[PDB]
């Protein structure tokens, strides 16, 4: 069809990415509330930083 070449048609389902909100929240909770408060003998100093 004449001068009708501006369509943006896709095929199949919509593209997307999974994130798994429930485990994201739960693991963030455990990290920031328990892992950060572990005794110092179970924590490591990251490389290339000074304390």
């Amino acid at each position: 069809v004449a001068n009708s070449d501006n369509n943006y048609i896709g095929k199949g389902n919509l593209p997307a990415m999974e994130i798994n909100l429930a485990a994201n929240l739960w693991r963030s909770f455990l990290y920031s509330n328990v892992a950060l408060y572990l005794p110092d003998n179970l924590k490591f100093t990251p490389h290339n930083i000074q304390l």
């Binding site: 990415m17 999974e18 994130i19 994201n24 693991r27 963030s28 909770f29 990290y31 920031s32 950060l36």
Partner: protein, 50 residues
């Protein structure tokens, strides 16, 4: 009998912050983000042939 109330955390904003130490990284449906193909390669005598 339903007493009018306001949410205490809305009336006074206790901006304790956000416990965001862990990143999230939403991942694609396919686990490897389907893209360009690759050819299987095995060494025959000294070089690599498809």
């Amino acid at each position: 009998q339903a007493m009018d109330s306001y949410d205490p955390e809305v009336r006074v904003i206790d901006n304790v912050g956000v416990e965001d130490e862990m990143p999230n990284y939403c991942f694609p449906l396919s686990g490897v983000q389907i893209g360009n193909r690759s050819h299987e390669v095995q060494r025959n005598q000294q070089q690599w042939q498809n």
